[PDB]
Amino acid sequence: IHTARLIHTSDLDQETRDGARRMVIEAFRDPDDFTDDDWDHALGGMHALISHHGALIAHGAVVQRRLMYRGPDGRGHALRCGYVEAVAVREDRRGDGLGTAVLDALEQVIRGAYQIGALSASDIARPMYIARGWLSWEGPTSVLTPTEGIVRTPEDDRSLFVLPVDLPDGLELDTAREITCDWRSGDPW
Amino acid sequence: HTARLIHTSDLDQETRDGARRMVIEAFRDFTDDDWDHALGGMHALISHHGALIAHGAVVQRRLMYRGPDGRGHALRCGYVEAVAVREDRRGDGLGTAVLDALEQVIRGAYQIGALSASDIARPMYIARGWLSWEGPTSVLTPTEGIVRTPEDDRSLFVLPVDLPDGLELDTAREITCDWRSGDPW
Ligand SMILES: CC(C)(COP(=O)(O)OP(=O)(O)OC[C@H]1O[C@@H](n2cnc3c(N)ncnc32)[C@H](O)[C@@H]1OP(=O)(O)O)[C@@H](O)C(=O)NCCC(=O)NCCS
Ligand SMILES: CC(C)(COP(=O)(O)OP(=O)(O)OC[C@H]1O[C@@H](n2cnc3c(N)ncnc32)[C@H](O)[C@@H]1OP(=O)(O)O)[C@@H](O)C(=O)NCCC(=O)NCCS
Ligand SMILES: CN[C@@H]1[C@@H](O)[C@@H](O[C@@H]2[C@@H](O)[C@H](O[C@H]3O[C@H]([C@@H](C)NC)CC[C@H]3N)[C@@H](N)C[C@H]2N)OC[C@]1(C)O
Structure with a gap:
């Protein structure tokens, strides 16, 4: 049984921060890329961490942003979004549910503080999000x-995958419609 | 006089409603959107015997700033919200302790802090290190x-904590915040 600890970017010390950053870049590279914009996108919210003998073996982060969505009534909503970034498990430790443990913790942040969770999944992690019940965005x-x-x-x-947890009053989310993220540098999704 | 820091996601319902009520009571108007703007980041809490007496919040946004090259920057911003102290306990430094704990989040986690305040708090904020935004x-x-x-x-006040790619701010130029319903600032 695995359990990630949740900790705010502001509570991460330089050591753990540089380490997390180097672990995630390593997990994503295979000697497209995980760049410093991708790392910057994972800063500012809650990190889920699992370590072994002082070394990070699993990481994930949920940060706040706005997702724009317009229903067929042509209204317009700017939803408080818990956006999942920099999820990664160290190669040699993969396949044993550490990745599940990271997402369990981040989902706890999403359900407790946001109207919707969203992410743009890598090909290898899509099965993970489907099995957890995330909705593939089709528009x-x-x-x-x-x-x-x-x-x-x-x-x-x-x-794109979304997880509606606390949509306002009577908003129905139609995955067939358009959806729009707010602006950032690097990849917007 | 030391406030504790808790993420929205770890607030129980009584604390949330209490904080919503206490902040509303302090603003004697705080709209429901004003409250939604306080949600999703780190809350600074000062309580006594189960009673919340000071609150503040810092939430993550993006502020857009254009340099003298036209190159644009979307800074990672910690935006201060819903700073309020119980009316009968003001003047004692609770508001300042709340600002202390929230600048700690800003320094640890964002490129820039930002807040909107009346000109009456203008000397304290200038005092605390914040720059007035003239543009x-x-x-x-x-x-x-x-x-x-x-x-x-x-x-509008900004706190330049960790600007990216050695950018330096010119407070005389344009700064534009990201969208949200209600008051954008
Ligand atoms: C994606 C990644 C984090 C997965 O970590 P992991 O620890 O191996 O994942 P887990 O062992 O916890 O697997 C969790 C669940 O995901 C699902 N899953 C993952 N790959 C699957 C596959 N090929 N077939 C079916 N289910 C799969 C399963 O439901 C699995 O539960 P199960 O194995 O009992 O069926 C990892 O491969 C990684 O670090 N890759 C680098 C790329 C990356 O970082 N992507 C980020 C995703 S946004
Ligand atoms: C603004 C507010 C949060 C400050 O709470 P507080 O506990 O009074 O804060 P502090 O004790 O740390 O300081 C109070 C402010 O008034 C000043 N102040 C209060 N009593 C004072 C006195 N007798 N003599 C001099 N200054 C006094 C404080 O020094 C500080 O402003 P200043 O230093 O610029 O003069 C409180 O007035 C409040 O809740 N207001 C309603 C909500 C609101 O307007 N919030 C917006 C915040 S930008
Ligand atoms: C439709 N093609 C996409 C592909 O573009 C690609 O999607 C990426 C997606 O993988 C990427 O996010 C992942 O990768 C980011 C980074 C490592 N670049 C690879 C870090 C966050 C992580 N969720 C997004 N920021 C950008 C998005 N275009 O991988 C999945 C996919 C289905 O093949």
Whole structure:
């Protein structure tokens, strides 16, 4: 049985922070890339950590952002989103449920503080999100840019997963419709 | 005089409702959207015997800033919200202890802190290290473009903690926040 500890970015010491960052980059690389924008995107919220003999073996982070969604009534909602980033298990420790343990903890943050969880999954982790009941987003994805308007993001079109936990009053989320993230540098999703 | 720091996700329901009520009572108007804006980040709590007497929150947003090259930056921002102290206990430094714990989150976790405050708190914030934002402000809206936020009596303060790629801020230029319903700032 595995249990990740949850800890805010502000409570991570330099050592653990640099270590987490180096573990996640290693897990994603195979000697597309995990860049410093990808790491920056994982900062600011709650980290889930599992370590062994002082070494991080599993990491995940949930940060706040806004997801824009417009229903068929043409209204418009800016939902408080718990966005999951930098989920990773050290290669040699994979296949034993550490990844499940990270997501268990992050989902606890999502359900307790956000209206919706979302992420853009790597191909190897999609099965994990399906089995946990995340909803694959089927409509076009877009990003709200500063200077153009809402711009389509075709590279992200079949990778988004959502987890509606606390949608306002009577909002029905139609996965067939468009969805739009707020602006950031690097990959918007 | 030391406030404790708890993420929204670990607040039980009584604490949440208590904090919502206490902050409403302090603002004697705090709208329901104003409360939603306080949710999802770290709450600074000071309580006595089960009674919440000071609160504050810092939530994660993005502030857009354009340099002299036109290159744009979407800074990771810790936005201070719903700082309030029980009316009968003001003047004792609780508000300042709440600001202390929240600047700790900002320093540990964000590139920049930001808050909107009246000109009456302007000397304390300047004192505490915060820069007054003299330039224009706006919000990146979903259906229109970047729309100028009209001036009110509150002014915007930023706390440059950890600016990326050695960027230096020119408080005279534009700063625009990300979208949310209710008051964008
Ligand atoms: C994705 C990753 C974190 C998975 O970690 P892991 O510890 O091996 O995962 P777990 O052992 O906890 O597997 C959890 C569940 O995911 C699902 N799963 C993962 N791969 C699966 C597969 N090929 N077939 C079926 N289910 C699969 C399963 O339901 C599994 O439960 P199960 O094995 O009992 O069926 C890991 O491979 C990794 O670090 N990859 C690098 C790429 C990356 O970081 N992606 C981030 C995902 S957004
Ligand atoms: C603003 C507020 C949170 C401060 O709470 P507090 O416990 O009074 O805070 P502190 O004791 O640390 O300081 C109170 C402020 O008033 C000042 N103040 C209060 N009594 C004072 C006195 N007798 N002499 C001088 N200054 C006094 C404090 O020094 C500080 O402002 P200043 O230092 O710039 O003058 C409180 O007034 C409040 O809850 N207001 C209602 C909600 C609100 O307006 N919040 C917005 C915050 S930006
Ligand atoms: C539709 N093609 C996508 C592909 O683009 C790709 O999606 C990536 C997706 O993998 C990527 O996120 C992952 O990878 C990020 C980083 C390591 N770049 C690979 C870190 C966060 C992690 N969730 C997103 N930020 C961008 C998104 N386009 O992988 C899955 C996919 C279904 O094959």
